[PDB]
Design a protein around this ligand. Sequence first.
Ligand SMILES: *[C@@H](O)[C@H](CC1=CC=NC1=O)NC(=O)[C@H](CC1CCCCC1)NC(=O)OCc1cccc(Cl)c1
Length: 165
Amino acid sequence: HMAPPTLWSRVTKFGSGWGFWVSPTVFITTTHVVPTGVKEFFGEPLSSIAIHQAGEFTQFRFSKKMRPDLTGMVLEEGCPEGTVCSVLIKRDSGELLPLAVRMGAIASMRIQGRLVHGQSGMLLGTIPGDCGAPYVHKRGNDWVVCGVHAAATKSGNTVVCAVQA
Ligand SMILES: *[C@@H](O)[C@H](CC1=CC=NC1=O)NC(=O)[C@H](CC1CCCCC1)NC(=O)OCc1cccc(Cl)c1
């Protein structure tokens, strides 16, 4: 299953990483990539945005249609345990690098002194700059998003995505 162009067009450069347009008004990203000390995102003043943050998961709901070209898609509260998802990585060069990952359990991982709520997976590598890339899978004719990239071990074999749950 290959992600189509419109789906890749949801993956958006943002701060020190990326985020993802779930719908014309809803954008998700990883909390630690969000720019600090700004007055606006995508030209919209912060006061016109509903910003929800839960650990490493951040969701923006804009007051105007920012991507009216897109259909809403489903955001799951986490990825299906045991399923192979795809991480839709865009590199700064523009290279597309979809990575297959078998998802594990939602848990708290010890990461750089913090206890980070998220979901682990095993790569079937990610690098600095990739955080915020979406974890997706295809259910029938339709793609679903279930998390955003947050961390990986030195070997790259274990990844962690932030989840809404
Ligand atoms: C994107 O910012 C990034 C991705 C990354 C670096 C190396 N391989 C990758 O996929 N994330 C980090 O650098 C991440 C940042 C922390 C910040 C505090 C909140 C949690 C995320 N840290 C990271 O990947 O550290 C390495 C690590 C250590 C222990 C366990 C794990 Cl899963 C990762």
